[PDB]
Amino acid sequence: TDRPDHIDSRVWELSETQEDWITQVHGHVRRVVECWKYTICCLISNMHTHRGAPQYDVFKWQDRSTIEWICSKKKVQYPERDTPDLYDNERAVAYKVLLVSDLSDHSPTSGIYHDLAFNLEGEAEESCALVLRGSQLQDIKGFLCRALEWVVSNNLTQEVVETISGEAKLQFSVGTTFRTLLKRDTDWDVIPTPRVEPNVPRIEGRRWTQMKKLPLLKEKEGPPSPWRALLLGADSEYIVCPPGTDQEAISWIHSQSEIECIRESKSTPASVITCLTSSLQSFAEGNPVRSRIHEDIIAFGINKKQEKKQSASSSASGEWKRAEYQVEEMSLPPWVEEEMVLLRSDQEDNWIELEKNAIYTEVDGVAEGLVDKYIEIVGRTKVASVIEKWQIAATRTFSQLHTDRSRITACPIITRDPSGNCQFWGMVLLGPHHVKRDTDNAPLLIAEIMGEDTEEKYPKHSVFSLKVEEKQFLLSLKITSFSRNKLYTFSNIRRVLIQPASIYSQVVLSRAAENNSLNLEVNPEIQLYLEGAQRGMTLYQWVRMILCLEFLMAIYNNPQMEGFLANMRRLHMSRHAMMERRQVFLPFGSRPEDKVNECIINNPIVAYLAKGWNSMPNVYY
Amino acid sequence: ECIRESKSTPASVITCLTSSLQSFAEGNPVRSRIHEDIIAFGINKKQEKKQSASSSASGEWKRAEYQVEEMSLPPWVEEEMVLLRSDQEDNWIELEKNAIYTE
Amino acid sequence: KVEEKQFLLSLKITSFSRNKLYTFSNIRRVLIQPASIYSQVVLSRAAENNSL
Amino acid sequence: ITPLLTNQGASPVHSFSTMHLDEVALRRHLGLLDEETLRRILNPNNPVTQKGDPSMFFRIENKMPQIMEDYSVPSCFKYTLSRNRHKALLNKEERYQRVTSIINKLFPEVLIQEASAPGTVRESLKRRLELVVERSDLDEERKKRILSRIF
Amino acid sequence: ESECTLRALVEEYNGACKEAPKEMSKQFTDYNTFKRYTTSKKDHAPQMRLVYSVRKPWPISMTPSKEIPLVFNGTKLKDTILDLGESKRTRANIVVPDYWSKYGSQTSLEVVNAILYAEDLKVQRFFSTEWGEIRYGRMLPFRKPVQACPTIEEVNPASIPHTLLQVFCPQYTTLDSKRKAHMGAVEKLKRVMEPICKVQTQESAVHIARSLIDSNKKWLPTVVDHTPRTAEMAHFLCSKYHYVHTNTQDLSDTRSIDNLCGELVKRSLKCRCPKETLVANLDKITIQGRPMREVLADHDGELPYLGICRVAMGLSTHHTMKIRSTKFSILNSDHPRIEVKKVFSLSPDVQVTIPYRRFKGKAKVYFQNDQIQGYFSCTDRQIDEIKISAPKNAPLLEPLLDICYYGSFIEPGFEQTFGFYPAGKREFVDSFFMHHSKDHKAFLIHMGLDKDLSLPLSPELNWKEPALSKVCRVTELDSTVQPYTSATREFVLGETLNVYTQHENGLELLICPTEIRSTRGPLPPGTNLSGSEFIDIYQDPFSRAKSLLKSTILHAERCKEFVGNMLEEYQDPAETTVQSLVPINTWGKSAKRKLQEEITSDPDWHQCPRKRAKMSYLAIIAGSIQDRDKKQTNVPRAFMLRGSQIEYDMKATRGLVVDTTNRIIVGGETVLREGKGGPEGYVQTGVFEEQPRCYLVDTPDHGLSMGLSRFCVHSQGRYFQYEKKISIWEETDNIKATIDSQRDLKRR
RNA sequence: AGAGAAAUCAAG
RNA sequence: UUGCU
RNA sequence: GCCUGUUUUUGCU
RNA sequence: GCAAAAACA
RNA sequence: GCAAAAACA
Numbered sequence A: 001t002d003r004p005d006h007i008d009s010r011v012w013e014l015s016e017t018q019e020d021w022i023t024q025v026h027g028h029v030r031r032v033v034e035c036w037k038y039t040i041c042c043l044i045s046n047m048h049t050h051r052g053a054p055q056y057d058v059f060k061w062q063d064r065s066t067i068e069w070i071c072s073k074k075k076v077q078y079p080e081r082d083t084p085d086l087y088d089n090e091r092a093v094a095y096k097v098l099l100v101s102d103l104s105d106h107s108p109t110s111g112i113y114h115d116l117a118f119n120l121e122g123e124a125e126e127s128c129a130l131v132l133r134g135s136q137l138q139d140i141k142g143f144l145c146r147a148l149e150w151v152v153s154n155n156l157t158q159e160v161v162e163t164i165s166g167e168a169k170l171q172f173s174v175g176t177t178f179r180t181l182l183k184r185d186t187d188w189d190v191i192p193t194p195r196v197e198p199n200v201p202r203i204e205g206r207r208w209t210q211m212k213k214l215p216l217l218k219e220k221e222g223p224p225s226p227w228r229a230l231l232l233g234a235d236s237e238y239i240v241c242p243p244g245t246d247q248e249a250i251s252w253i254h255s256q257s258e259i260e261c262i263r264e265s266k267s268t269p270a271s272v273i274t275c276l277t278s279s280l281q282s283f284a285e286g287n288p289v290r291s292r293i294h295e296d297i298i299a300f301g302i303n304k305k306q307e308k309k310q311s312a313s314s315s316a317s318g319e320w321k322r323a324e325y326q327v328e329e330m331s332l333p334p335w336v337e338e339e340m341v342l343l344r345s346d347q348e349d350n351w352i353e354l355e356k357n358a359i360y361t362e363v364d365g366v367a368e369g370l371v372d373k374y375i376e377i378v379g380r381t382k383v384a385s386v387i388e389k390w391q392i393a394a395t396r397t398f399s400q401l402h403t404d405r406s407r408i409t410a411c412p413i414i415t416r417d418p419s420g421n422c423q424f425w426g427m428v429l430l431g432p433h434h435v436k437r438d439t440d441n442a443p444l445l446i447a448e449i450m451g452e453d454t455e456e457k458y459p460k461h462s463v464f465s466l467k468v469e470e471k472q473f474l475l476s477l478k479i480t481s482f483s484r485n486k487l488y489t490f491s492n493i494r495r496v497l498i499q500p501a502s503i504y505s506q507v508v509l510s511r512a513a514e515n516n517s518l519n520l521e522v523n524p525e526i527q528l529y530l531e532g533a534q535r536g537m538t539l540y541q542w543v544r545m546i547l548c549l550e551f552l553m554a555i556y557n558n559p560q561m562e563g564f565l566a567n568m569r570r571l572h573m574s575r576h577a578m579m580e581r582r583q584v585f586l587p588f589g590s591r592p593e594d595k596v597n598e599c600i601i602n603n604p605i606v607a608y609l610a611k612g613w614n615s616m617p618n619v620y621y
Numbered sequence B: 001e002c003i004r005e006s007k008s009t010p011a012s013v014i015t016c017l018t019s020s021l022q023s024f025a026e027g028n029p030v031r032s033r034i035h036e037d038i039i040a041f042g043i044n045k046k047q048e049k050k051q052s053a054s055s056s057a058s059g060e061w062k063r064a065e066y067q068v069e070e071m072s073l074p075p076w077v078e079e080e081m082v083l084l085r086s087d088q089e090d091n092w093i094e095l096e097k098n099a100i101y102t103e
Numbered sequence C: 001k002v003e004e005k006q007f008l009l010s011l012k013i014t015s016f017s018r019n020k021l022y023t024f025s026n027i028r029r030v031l032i033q034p035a036s037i038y039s040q041v042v043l044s045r046a047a048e049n050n051s052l
Numbered sequence D: 001i002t003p004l005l006t007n008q009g010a011s012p013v014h015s016f017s018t019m020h021l022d023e024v025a026l027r028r029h030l031g032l033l034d035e036e037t038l039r040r041i042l043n044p045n046n047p048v049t050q051k052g053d054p055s056m057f058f059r060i061e062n063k064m065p066q067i068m069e070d071y072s073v074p075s076c077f078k079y080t081l082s083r084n085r086h087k088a089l090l091n092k093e094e095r096y097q098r099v100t101s102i103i104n105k106l107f108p109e110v111l112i113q114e115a116s117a118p119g120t121v122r123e124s125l126k127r128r129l130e131l132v133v134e135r136s137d138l139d140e141e142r143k144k145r146i147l148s149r150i151f
Numbered sequence E: 001e002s003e004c005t006l007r008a009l010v011e012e013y014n015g016a017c018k019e020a021p022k023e024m025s026k027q028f029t030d031y032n033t034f035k036r037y038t039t040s041k042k043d044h045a046p047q048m049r050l051v052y053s054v055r056k057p058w059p060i061s062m063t064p065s066k067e068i069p070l071v072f073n074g075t076k077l078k079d080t081i082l083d084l085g086e087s088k089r090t091r092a093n094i095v096v097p098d099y100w101s102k103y104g105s106q107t108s109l110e111v112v113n114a115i116l117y118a119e120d121l122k123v124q125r126f127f128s129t130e131w132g133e134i135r136y137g138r139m140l141p142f143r144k145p146v147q148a149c150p151t152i153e154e155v156n157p158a159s160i161p162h163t164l165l166q167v168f169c170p171q172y173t174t175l176d177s178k179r180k181a182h183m184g185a186v187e188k189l190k191r192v193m194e195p196i197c198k199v200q201t202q203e204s205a206v207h208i209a210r211s212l213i214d215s216n217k218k219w220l221p222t223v224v225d226h227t228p229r230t231a232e233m234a235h236f237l238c239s240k241y242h243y244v245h246t247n248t249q250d251l252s253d254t255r256s257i258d259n260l261c262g263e264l265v266k267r268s269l270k271c272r273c274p275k276e277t278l279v280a281n282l283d284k285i286t287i288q289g290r291p292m293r294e295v296l297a298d299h300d301g302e303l304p305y306l307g308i309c310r311v312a313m314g315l316s317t318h319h320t321m322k323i324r325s326t327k328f329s330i331l332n333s334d335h336p337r338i339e340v341k342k343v344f345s346l347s348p349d350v351q352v353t354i355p356y357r358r359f360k361g362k363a364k365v366y367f368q369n370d371q372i373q374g375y376f377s378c379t380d381r382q383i384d385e386i387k388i389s390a391p392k393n394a395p396l397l398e399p400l401l402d403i404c405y406y407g408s409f410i411e412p413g414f415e416q417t418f419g420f421y422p423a424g425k426r427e428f429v430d431s432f433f434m435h436h437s438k439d440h441k442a443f444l445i446h447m448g449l450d451k452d453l454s455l456p457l458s459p460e461l462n463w464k465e466p467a468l469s470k471v472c473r474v475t476e477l478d479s480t481v482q483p484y485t486s487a488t489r490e491f492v493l494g495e496t497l498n499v500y501t502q503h504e505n506g507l508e509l510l511i512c513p514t515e516i517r518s519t520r521g522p523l524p525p526g527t528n529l530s531g532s533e534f535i536d537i538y539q540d541p542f543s544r545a546k547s548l549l550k551s552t553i554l555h556a557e558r559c560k561e562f563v564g565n566m567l568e569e570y571q572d573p574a575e576t577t578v579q580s581l582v583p584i585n586t587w588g589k590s591a592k593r594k595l596q597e598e599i600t601s602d603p604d605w606h607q608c609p610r611k612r613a614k615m616s617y618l619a620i621i622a623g624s625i626q627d628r629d630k631k632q633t634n635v636p637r638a639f640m641l642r643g644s645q646i647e648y649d650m651k652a653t654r655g656l657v658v659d660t661t662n663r664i665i666v667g668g669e670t671v672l673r674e675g676k677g678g679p680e681g682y683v684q685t686g687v688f689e690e691q692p693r694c695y696l697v698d699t700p701d702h703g704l705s706m707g708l709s710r711f712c713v714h715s716q717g718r719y720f721q722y723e724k725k726i727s728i729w730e731e732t733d734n735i736k737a738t739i740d741s742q743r744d745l746k747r748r
Numbered sequence F: 001a002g003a004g005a006a007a008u009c010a011a012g
Numbered sequence G: 001u002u003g004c005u
Numbered sequence H: 001g002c003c004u005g006u007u008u009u010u011g012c013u
Numbered sequence I, J: 001g002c003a004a005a006a007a008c009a
């Protein structure tokens, strides 16, 4: 522990309760120095006998009663303030061990004892050298030199010299004016000494109340929330194109396409469609970056901040007031349930093609079997296709944002099937961007293929009819502003598959551990509150729409969603406790539902989760 | 100290020998195992080889078709044949004499 | 190095069956084959003169 | 150019039970990576990962336990990625880096324990340099003309 | 050659002096601070730039070279046109490493082997463990610290810096650093890193060396009695739903060290104040070249005797109370386990006592045995509650009976007698276990029966087994329960070598000798019990005589004490050794007489080692087992040891002791080398910042061998001039004598 | 426009 | 210049 | 832009 | 010791 | 590694 290596364990133990080291300057160093002196005393009195008894008797670190008991028999007496360290019976002289930093200038001390002065290098004073034997000198020099080596190894030379000299600076001291500065904002001194008797009073407190029924999360009222996301989701579709590169696919599409406006929104003027076509042209000859056109100003909001500032200044009137921002509250839209019902239908392709890990052991075999089962139960699903589309679009748009450009960049969304045919999900146009931070927005124009058009779901989307090889498709073409951090996050959106895989693997492995054998084909009947009533349901489709809802929450993650999910865990735990006949008690002013209700403003999936929570029973018998 | 190192006999096995020379010097002809003994006697070598082969298995089963390599006459045979004849100061053979009763 | 004397120590890892070790434990029998010849040669000289 | 490595598009070599195993060693053990390419990817003199300054090396049971020469990171796939292009304090810290590097080269023992040499940095490294040159087993004239040029 | 390295160092020093006039006028110790200034190595977020960085036109930054062609087949490799010559300036494509994987200069095979050595160890270690069968059982985790990776040697942390310094920089070390290092680890590390240091830099080589000889324990959830004693394959052998049954021996010397410690404890308890005796002996016994204190600090095991010896040296222990197969740990208690000195006297005058232990107050004790684990809460001697987690249909006889014995809850066997008067503690405890094995109704009458069928414990002690009635107050474990201690426990070694744990209201017994059961085992290799007072531990007569002769020859005071105690029939700490070395004979009085002539003729005999050898030989013969019947005869010139063909000679011309004019060899080892390497060690004797007027040896080794009376070593700019030791005694002995005299004077 | 949510981006 | 299911 | 504390995973000195 | 990454409060 | 017809390790 704190014992130096050269100090003997017995000496260290004996020195613990000899002086109050905490109040002394450099208490540890002082204790080490006292141990040095005691070890020197031990080395002086080493196996030396005169009349069958030890020649030297050591008075250091011994009880004072016995010291006086043996001091009377020697016809001597010493005061309490300074007692000699040892005494020589053969010569009958009291000796005190001293350590000094310079033997050249040393002077005697009080005549009650003689000083055995030693240097930090093991040297001894001339008289001290002549009194002791050569073996004692060598042993003392060796011990002191080992101590010096320990000191220089630990860089403690200054402290050791200070303790030897005895100046003993307090190692810290607060001056006069600094104390006045410190005591400005407090009613106590530097060391507070209140004049009150320590006591804990009795305070009349409130009563803890049982939560007999679970709280009911309030549902906001207002217009249904529009689809506020970067991409379409379940309405996303693609166009089949002959196998080849992205440039070849875009050239094939552009040369064989007809665009006709069928629904125009005020948020996204239809006149910007030319922009997209221009980008197609630019990307047809392998130029993903094109010069600006007029409609780009409308499309990407070029110089919009300055125009809005001038308009505000022209229309400015009244008196300055605080900000007082307002967030519009919107109700749960009908399209969330349709999104849940969709996005789950089976697909022809697997849409999850992950290279299989190596298999060496049976543990590896069962792990890869479980992963393969999960992939084949959630692979052929619209969620996987939409996840692939989102990841491809996010990566393609992110890769074009680590620079400053005043031109228009095209980021096509193209995937490929096992057969090799291209699949056109849409294109992303990145406008003039000069990013200084990772959180600022950049303009984007998102053209993508719909499957079905809803006015109440896409109010800011201008839907176009696209004719390609006697085939009809719909086009979204929305104007948006999106950030670098969000794009990077959605570039790794494939990680959302872990949580439903976690549920599936936990169920399967729990069943395996219960039966002490792995089945790998279990599809048990999970009991769930479906329509306010508890019904059974297969595990595979449970994992399927768990993945659906996880993806829906991942793309709709905002402060409201973060707060709602963070505060819903307490209510989830309370419900789980009450279904096991456990009572829940709450403090006086306890309203756990308020911290959840404050986060329910306009997020459609937060409202969907709130409705799901309200649907299930609140009272458990 | 090692002069010549061979991949078939790693140097570390000397730690085994010095572990035995000391142990036998203490009245313990049999000693406990040490780490250097692991690669000294093929301990767990069958499992090592089988697991490595299973992990690196590829292709399809074919006949064993074992072969032995043909190797020429070593240059050291004549030195062996002439060095076993070196004269020695001792008899090196101690066989108890039998009794004699007839000629 | 033993008493300022040089030696070479050869270490080999091998593995042998109990049959081979037992067979080599009685290796002294190899002395039988040559002696026969010598013995015969001696008897040959006896067959030359009936005087061993 | 066959991939032969995970970052080169080869089939994964890491399994669930081989999370802790290095890729190169595991591929060598399984035979997926022959010695012909091993002697190339693990070259300590490859230009890809060659350090810009000479580095110091220990020598166990050698007459000169300190050998300084050019070095490269063994794996050629441990390269660095180029970056696009308290100000004077950064230059001061670069000077501190230079002093730390020369101290580490001349005082290997502080590489394992705390620094406790007496005196200033200049005098301490001067004495250590004189001592190490004195123990270089070179002849006398070499030593004198080496210590002649020490500032 | 070495000349280029010196040129490089001189030029670097000159550049540092010139480019940085400051930053070097500071003290050298200031390196401990300004080494931490490593800014400009900071980047915002490399994970958010990798995709873009790889796809830049010239992503890779490298130093200029001619090995990479400017333009390869079709493609252009390096951008060596813009500013060639500015250090790490050249820019190359992402395919350049791929181009180097082929069509590149190769390297010798030993270099490749050296680079991959550390990882190849892990690879073969994984492909060497036998992969068992997966067993699924819904495991209940036990969170404990386990070692991250296996080590080639076990070295205590305090000795880590000195060991590495002995491997890489012997020339900058002192003899104290040499003694504090683990020389076996030093040799292993030198052999391992001889090729490694040729391909790894200084700091890298130090890193691999420390990683090979450091523990670096980390907290993980493992499974009871299935821990792989290393976290290397924890992700593979256990996943909270299964384990892989793996087989592995101890592969360690911990058991041998336990055997040595047990022998020392057993032999120490037979003398006055066993604690001081054991502490003194442990400070003088060494294993290989390492002192016993440091090897105890190295092996921090779970074993009782090892824990006793570690506590005797001021170290801690991880031993836990264990009754046969069940381990117990007190989670919390109001008062320690109070001992009861219950007497079962066989007669009014003849009495036999069997002390036991119990709880006074409320206590809660976790227990585990095999896969069964849980806790029990009790008050005094009445059991209050039991929580158990165990596999279904498991037999819970032995864990419950171990709980009963631990708490003395059941009293057909506590506070009263079984029947016929017990012979002793061993027989009484064995009778208790054998009686209660076939009679578990005491448990049932202790905690009654319950009419509720949800209780999982059956009356016949089977977990979750249907029955008519169920045992009350024994239920399934609700939540995970595990013993954890927050404050670092400090252990007290009381008399009879009892290791107590410091509880708040008293002392908690942890380890108690006289009921620890362990058969005699092999001693650790290289054990040197020639220190003092314990030589009969050696079973071999060879080593048993060798240690005694090394003790007598190398120490004049020990030889004098041995002769004095062996001549006048005094108490000799090695009487048993002398009796067991010499067979029954009639040479006692003759040898004693010879001792008389050789002490009277030359009273100054105890300085010539030859005279010491002759006197020790005569003394060993003198106190042998004298035959009762046969008459005394003259002492033979040489004799034979018991049960061996080892010949011991007077003149030491042959056999166990050979004393040539140049050197004395005892048992095949040169104990004395005349002229160089005196018997006594060295003392440091001076620390200087300037070259002393002595000989500066290269390393601590190549010193202590020339036998010089004055030699200096270098360490961090300081010089240490070891000279010689002339004092016959030792600092530890001096301190012990002074403290003993002080305590005796206090008592008297 | 838009992104967005308690105040910003929408370049010089 | 552009290709993750 | 990017605090403090704890823990964890890498790599470099 | 340094640099990066992550989680938690 | 030992063998010599895949054995032992």
Ligand SMILES: *O[C]1[C]([C]OP([O])(=O)OP([O])(=O)OP([O])(=O)O[C][C]2O[C](N3=[C]N([C])C4=C3N=C([N])[N]C4=O)[C]([O])[C]2[O])O[C](N2[C]=NC3=C2N=[C]N=C3[N])[C]1O[C]
Residues within 6 Å of the ligand: D110, D111, D112, D113, D114, D115, E161, E203, E206, E207, E210, H013, I001
């Ligand atoms: O913080 C940290 C510490 C901790 O760790 P441990 O475990 O304790 O161990 P050690 O190291 O031994 O400790 P100390 O004594 O305190 O220290 C020592 C010395 O030496 C040095 N080093 C070390 N190492 C290991 C190293 C070094 N250097 C280099 N370059 N490399 C290496 O490796 C130091 O600095 C000191 O002075 O400790 C330390 N550490 C750890 N680890 C590490 C460190 N450092 C650095 N590096 C590393 N890697 C720290 O502090 C300082």
